[model samples]
Target: GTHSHGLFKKLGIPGPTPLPFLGNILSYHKGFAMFDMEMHKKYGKVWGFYDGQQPVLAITDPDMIKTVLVKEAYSVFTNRRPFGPVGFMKSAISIAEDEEWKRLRSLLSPTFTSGKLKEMVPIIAQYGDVLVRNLRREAETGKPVTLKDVFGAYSMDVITSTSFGVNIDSLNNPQDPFVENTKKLLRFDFLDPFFLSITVFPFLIPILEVLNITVFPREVTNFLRKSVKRMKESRRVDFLQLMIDSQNKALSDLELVAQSIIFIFAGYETTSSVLSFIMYELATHPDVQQKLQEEIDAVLPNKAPPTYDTVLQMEYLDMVVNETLRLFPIAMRLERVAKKDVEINGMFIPKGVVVMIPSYALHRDPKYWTEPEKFLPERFSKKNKDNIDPYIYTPFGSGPRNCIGMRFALMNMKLALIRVLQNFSFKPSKETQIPLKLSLGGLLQPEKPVVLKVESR
Candidate 1:
């Protein structure tokens, strides 16, 4: 586009040449991880790109990433990408900016604390039980199980139950309305023409708004909005209720519903994908799997119930999860908008420019990681983890604005892994892809179903 004709050159940053009116939109067909890696390799650690006329600088160097994400986060990089209009989502913590974001984040932080997460252990473990029982049927048949579907149901169950205090057995009742609507929501195609059109041309949003067109399906939003409002009547000590109880009923109905909606959106597919990738890694790497199983057995021996403390005791389990997260991070790239013209170290970042952290590429950088492609859990072990830099291995990102539900996600993932490894083992099935092909765009997801054979342990 003419908008970015000399933007990169003027900024003293190198990047792939962009075409008129499209910028580098078409070049992203290979997905964020690969595309960002290619750009970083060819253009160096700090490079520029464009989404239509929007200028984006990709920062891969540790010092710069740390500076943007942590050191000057609140001062310079305070908000995420600027959007045109998002209805109720504007009130959500993720979309909210400045004072609004700080207020929402502070109020919601208590719900994710260790004490709250500990209370959630039993509820999540109950779902893990259901997960194990459901998987037993597949294990008995000796047929390969598509883990994304399995873990998807489990993640949905945990999020819905914990957030809204609605016990949904999605594992058994896949046809439930909640499950069906969530499935519809997850059907969002990253490469859809309308989506790419918006990314390439944000100015079109005003026109689309004039035409009454919206990003997400109104049907799903309407259903969830109505459901969340109805759920507000309940007095359970859950996420929604905790938010309500905080600040002496300060949040409005729209804000409550918006946060609840974002919780499901954040926890659903992302957690499922992490579980799927962990299984894939465990299946292929027999040694790691065996070691993890031994750790699980030792901790939760004799069929003891998996409490929060017990799950936390497995050091090797922690390494395995961290290693999987290192390789298959939910979001391959994390972004922030520069609120003011800022200089980090020696480089100048213009106000309004989006600074993208290519975390997937950083995780695999040979400078920071030895044999980065290899799945080695030892990288996170007690003796070696201290040598690693936090900025170089950002799975849930870094700093105050990082993923708020990170601990919640990790607890659920670990509990599920412990429960499953307690009863069964994952083996690569005939349908499993050797070098798991991942789809290009949006969240990092597998190209095909993550099929694995589950044998009773």
Candidate 2:
């Protein structure tokens, strides 16, 4: 509709023509990110493009995004398209919408509440201790450790314990099948383009499904299904168990499986990415690292691993994590659909148009930030935070649909970082890559390994 009507004619969306069937696939292929950034630079706040035959709009204005997420009046954009075949297992909070999303989020949110997370503090601390011990053992050889792999293991152990009620001990055994499977799931690259296509062209999904093309791998699905089966038989009371226990007759087995898979996958990847980015930034900015270390030292003189209160009480550490999220948000893009034609910021958005909130771009905008590209954790200090717009700093998204696991993820990250910094100093190794590049085809990740030399404190 709108692509063929007055909207396209009026917007003059600065991009290539939509091909007969391919739409803007060529331009998308060349650079989806570059295209969006360039258009924002050229067209001010809002711009439009076509993906194949589907019309797409990207919005950067915070007020406009706020309206789309919170004030939308209808259901035109309530559903989330699955990411190809592989998406079958991923039924957690991200893809679900409306009633289904509400119910699942309600069931899952308690698992990450402050009280629940407090109980999990010791579990997270244990893993952090293991991580520090492992690194200390490695430091004996005076060799560089890949912080990405190290943090990946740390996150995996924490997620597995908290999500599945099992300890895979990734710190000691990185090759454990459970841990390996989680890594494989996050590293899977084929689904992103297919997923993007499905998001823009919902009509193509059934055809793609008919061809048996999906993002979920047979191995991943089978692995997750088996894990759920095992967990069900064991009748444990972990995060997945909590969700399953909360589900009523209205929920389907497939839905339960999907939600469980979401917990495991999201828990592992996003937290791991946050930890990795924090370590990368700390390694690069030695002053920030030293300041954090000083705080850690003063707070816990005995080098005792962080407890729940201690982790929460470290104000500077909190700022550093918030700032890290601002710089390298795990989910760089937040998408929503318009429920009805609505006017936002003097522009009319028709029903069924896709809206994107580029959190990564917003977090780095010069208007909202001074020296935005630099790693300045102080920007999140009490005074600075009060001066900034709250909507512009959402790494976990905003409003009713923000990430439920935000607290859990942050606790895991803080404990792990505190543990690492207490006993070790991270020096950027020769293997450490500079000017990190986002993953070309999948989620945001460094193109090269982040290596650090860890020395005993």
Candidate 3:
């Protein structure tokens, strides 16, 4: 039968009928939540949707996700289609696959090791104090401060200093060209949707080439290339230098620039967004806030910023960070392309088909969580952690392709939060919105700016 290979009959995947040309693009444009929520309600664990002409199977089952990510190995998903034109100039560890991804991952692995990140602690702690001093200055004027902007600046400074080995001082000098351009790049635009459409159908590359559709600004790419060259000239030994020194057979200047760019963008944007959301959540839930403050105070009683050693000792802080990731994952979706036909949950997924593991939706599914909406850090307790499936809570993703900067990113975020909480109590102001709305574009930000009154303790 013509319908034999249809997703519905093969996998019992339930979804709306695809239009002749539009496929599921209409539902996707409506919002990922609209389709994912409806599918979860009707399909239980797994379902299928058409992303333009391609069939995408959305999976929420933890065991199934583990199998696709680990057991079946990388064979099931080999390539990650890049977003736009800029994707051409740079292919970092995030997008590489097969032997290429393996070589890059191994070469870059040591840069993010615990020992390497420890060496950068002085720099991280310095930024933590900078953030505190800035907030203290802001509180003096008695004006409501936007946590997102504040954290964004702090994060940018940390990344610039740590990754590029330069003190851009984004916290103090907000108008720096690099910082401004980075903000522009992070901002979501209509071009994103069109670029994503093209990504779905890579055959449109020539059309995009004609249209000159680029995911990154040409100036930004040029700046990064120049920055990497300058760093090499200066004999800087930061993370970028580590990769350059590796001199691996597979790495190229463009590949090096791509990795550096990923480090900067991922290092700052996601961590800052997570910190801002945590402050807002803590403000509304004062009891949780006080408990966390107590934990911070107990660990570092002198109101000093978090030292490298102190950060590791702060268990509750880790829980809070984990909980925040659960609520607002920087990359809300994890995608893979099947490299071979495979059976998942009794359904045969054909090679070249796209598969989506929505971290946002999966984190909130009731099947894997109890009272899925509440902000409960206790769920991350050591004992509770043992009970949860590793695949169920991969805010940083899973398998060999997991985020390389996970440890480095966490240190910056944790130290920054600890420093801020030590000196001030973050309370929600009238400007703070309840049940924060996620910004439609640009790095999953809070819809409205998070305004909180910083009262000096």
Most accurate candidate by TM-score: 1
lDDT tens digits, residue span 1-102, model 1 = 385558788867898887888888788787778888888788777888888788889988888888989999899999998764466667899889988999
lDDT-best of 2 and 3: 3
* Per-residue lDDT value at 433 in model 2: 78
Candidate 3 matches the true fold with a TM-score of: 0.92
Question: What is the TM-score (0 to 1) of candidate 2?
Answer: 0.90
Tell me the lDDT of candidate 2.
0.73
Q: What TM-score does candidate 1 reach?
A: 0.96
Higher-ranked by lDDT: 1 or 3: 1
Ranking by lDDT: 1, 3, 2
Could you list the CA RMSD of all candidates, in the order they appear?
1.7, 2.8, 2.7
Clashes of each: 2, 11, 1
For each candidate, what is the lDDT? 0.85, 0.73, 0.76
